[PDB]
Amino acid sequence: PFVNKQFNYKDPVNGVDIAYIKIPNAGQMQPVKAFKIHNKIWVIPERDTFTNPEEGDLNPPPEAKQVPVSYYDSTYLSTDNEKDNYLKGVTKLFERIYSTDLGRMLLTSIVRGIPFWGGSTIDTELKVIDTNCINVIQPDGSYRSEELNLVIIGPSADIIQFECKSFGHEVLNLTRNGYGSTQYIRFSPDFTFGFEESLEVDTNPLLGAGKFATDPAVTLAHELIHAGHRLYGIAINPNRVFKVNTNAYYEMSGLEVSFEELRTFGGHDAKFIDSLQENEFRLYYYNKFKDIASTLNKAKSIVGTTASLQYMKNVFKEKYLLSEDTSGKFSVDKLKFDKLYKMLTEIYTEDNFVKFFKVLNRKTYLNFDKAVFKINIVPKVNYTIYDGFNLRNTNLAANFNGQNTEINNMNFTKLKNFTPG
Ligand SMILES: [Zn+2]
């Protein structure tokens, strides 16, 4: 959410909000300087060569296997000045998101979505799952395990491959069982995508569609929406995908889109999901919350020297919005679950964010992207928390000129056009 201080990459560690940390990975990782921009949320201004074991180097894949919608550059995020710019770019986008009521609500839901403490083989024992924490070097030197819900990290080899990923436990699908898990978002504020849009205002089209760029804040929000689903364990299985096409004869016609993506994008598209299908998951996740409520009712002990069992029971009461009687027994409110579920899945959508931001965006998640641009969101004369690229009191503030790559060409440097396909 809102970032109290204006972090500088050079600022010395203080253990408090600036520290050296290590991610729970099966690889020999060295500590990296990280920043806690808000309770439960950290930013690691580094290329991500830590999360995925088979992605420890920024080496691009064979030219052939290289998808048209991709881009490589090993120099990106290699210098302190770049890391500083990255840090400030991410912070600024969080403020832009938080500056809206919708963004404020999502960030609050994210902060309260602490992954559930279901890491024990003993059902009556609450225990934290190790992959939902980071190891932080304390001021004195030693490492200490700390919980967090979200980490924003730079991309790995493919600079424009943004995503929301996390570590799995064992036989538990943490992102789909109501438990949730710490989310790692590969993202960059230094690049954005191009898309065509026809703002025609007459009968017939003449000048044609203009070339516009996606507002980075929309992209981050999209990613935070995925994080919101995942932290609450209500993400839709990725094997649930929809088929779309104009003359789709039969048996896989036209690229496919997952239910998760569609739901996240929202808009008229999201309506491509029957109320039955939408009600089946609602029920499915309603039962998972009930199992969580039942686990907390039978809990008798807790592991760790951090929090007390009552504290964590309260923490999860606030997260799942559980009902509590006089004896202190928890239960899931059928109606309250409907509210929280609708919020996380129908209110927090890319479409609604586009509306609150008042910017131009692709009309469909399916709407292909033309090319990729280099941008600089840090300078106030290029982009602001409230207007984005469409600076008020300027010509950029008209007809989404600020996002027009031709008009505001000085704020967009093209790198590569997706020609192959
Ligand atoms: Zn997505």
Side-chain angles (χ1 to χ4, degrees):
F2 188 77
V3 181
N4 283 313
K5 57 251 290 298
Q6 295 178 59
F7 289 100
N8 284 304
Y9 186 70
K10 254 78 193 305
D11 297 334
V13 304
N14 60 39
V16 186
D17 40 45
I18 304 183
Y20 290 116
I21 73 175
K22 297 175 90 105
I23 299 168
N25 184 290
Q28 293 175 169
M29 172 194 186
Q30 293 185 60
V32 292
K33 191 165 186 177
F35 304 73
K36 188 172 140 179
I37 71 175
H38 192 280
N39 180 209
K40 264 57 166 75
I41 301 176
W42 300 68
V43 174
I44 304 188
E46 296 272 338
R47 295 294 285 288
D48 176 21
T49 60
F50 321 112
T51 305
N52 197 311
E54 304 184 7
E55 289 167 51
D57 53 46
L58 305 176
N59 288 306
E63 304 189 62
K65 242 89 73 172
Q66 176 168 170
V67 181
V69 182
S70 69
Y71 178 71
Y72 304 79
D73 179 28
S74 75
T75 193
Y76 177 61
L77 273 196
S78 65
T79 64
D80 293 9
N81 302 291
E82 276 181 276
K83 288 175 185 180
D84 180 62
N85 198 65
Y86 177 96
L87 186 62
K88 282 161 184 172
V90 176
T91 288
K92 198 170 175 185
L93 294 178
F94 265 97
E95 298 293 7
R96 178 143 167 65
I97 290 167
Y98 189 83
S99 84
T100 70
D101 297 326
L102 194 66
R104 180 174 290 86
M105 301 195 80
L106 173 57
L107 290 173
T108 291
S109 292
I110 289 182
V111 172
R112 304 152 94 247
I114 292 86
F116 187 56
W117 281 37
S120 174
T121 46
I122 305 181
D123 69 341
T124 69
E125 185 182 74
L126 284 199
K127 184 183 182 177
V128 70
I129 292 177
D130 75 313
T131 46
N132 289 154
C133 312
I134 49 172
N135 283 312
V136 176
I137 291 177
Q138 306 301 299
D140 88 316
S142 56
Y143 282 104
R144 195 175 79 65
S145 188
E146 188 173 321
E147 292 173 75
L148 73 182
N149 309 341
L150 177 72
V151 174
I152 305 304
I153 186 167
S156 47
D158 186 357
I159 291 179
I160 60 171
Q161 175 199 282
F162 304 154
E163 56 175 47
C164 192
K165 60 192 286 187
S166 45
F167 296 100
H169 184 45
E170 306 183 3
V171 65
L172 304 185
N173 320 115
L174 294 183
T175 68
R176 320 180 224 112
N177 77 339
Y179 282 27
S181 60
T182 299
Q183 299 305 308
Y184 286 79
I185 302 181
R186 280 182 184 166
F187 167 79
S188 174
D190 306 303
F191 303 88
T192 197
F193 316 83
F195 61 103
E196 290 183 69
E197 177 69 62
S198 294
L199 298 178
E200 304 296 300
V201 294
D202 297 61
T203 304
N204 57 60
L206 309 78
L207 187 79
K211 294 66 160 50
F212 295 99
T214 296
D215 184 315
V218 172
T219 307
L220 182 59
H222 170 103
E223 242 36 70
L224 298 172
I225 290 180
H226 278 306
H229 299 160
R230 299 189 142 234
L231 284 162
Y232 285 77
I234 59 173
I236 305 306
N237 197 297
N239 59 39
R240 299 305 296 284
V241 305
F242 293 110
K243 181 186 70 67
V244 294
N245 185 285
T246 61
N247 294 180
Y249 307 105
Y250 47 65
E251 196 171 0
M252 307 301 260
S253 296
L255 284 72
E256 57 184 10
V257 191
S258 78
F259 193 124
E260 244 301 300
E261 290 311 329
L262 203 54
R263 160 211 255 176
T264 299
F265 190 79
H268 292 300
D269 306 299
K271 269 289 295 181
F272 296 136
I273 303 170
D274 191 60
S275 295
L276 278 174
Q277 300 169 295
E278 202 267 62
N279 200 179
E280 298 182 65
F281 292 133
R282 177 222 239 65
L283 228 299
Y284 178 85
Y285 293 120
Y286 174 67
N287 292 105
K288 295 296 174 163
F289 276 33
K290 283 176 74 173
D291 291 328
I292 291 172
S294 178
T295 298
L296 294 163
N297 285 152
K298 295 168 184 293
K300 271 295 179 183
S301 57
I302 190 167
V303 177
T305 64
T306 288
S308 67
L309 175 56
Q310 248 303 309
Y311 182 78
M312 293 304 174
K313 301 188 80 175
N314 286 334
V315 159
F316 295 125
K317 181 193 171 187
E318 298 166 27
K319 174 188 184 185
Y320 302 107
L321 289 183
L322 304 174
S323 279
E324 176 185 21
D325 62 43
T326 64
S327 66
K329 178 185 179 182
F330 290 135
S331 178
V332 178
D333 191 1
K334 65 289 182 61
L335 186 276
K336 220 57 185 174
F337 174 80
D338 287 320
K339 308 295 290 180
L340 182 61
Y341 190 83
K342 182 190 190 70
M343 189 71 80
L344 294 168
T345 64
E346 299 187 301
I347 298 178
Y348 307 153
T349 70
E350 183 172 320
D351 192 67
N352 290 332
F353 270 105
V354 168
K355 289 179 195 173
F356 278 75
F357 287 140
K358 291 79 56 62
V359 302
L360 191 60
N361 198 68
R362 53 183 175 179
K363 291 298 174 294
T364 311
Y365 173 92
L366 324 184
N367 198 183
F368 317 112
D369 295 306
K370 296 287 75 60
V372 295
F373 303 98
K374 182 69 178 55
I375 56 178
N376 197 347
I377 262 60
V378 181
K380 192 125 161 48
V381 290
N382 297 341
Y383 182 109
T384 78
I385 293 171
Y386 284 99
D387 300 316
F389 283 111
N390 312 320
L391 317 178
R392 65 187 61 183
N393 299 315
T394 77
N395 45 297
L396 266 25
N399 304 72
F400 306 112
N401 270 36
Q403 304 179 65
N404 192 296
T405 299
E406 315 251 70
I407 305 180
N408 204 325
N409 63 296
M410 273 289 104
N411 261 297
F412 301 100
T413 307
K414 177 166 298 186
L415 303 173
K416 184 211 299 298
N417 305 74
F418 311 138
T419 313

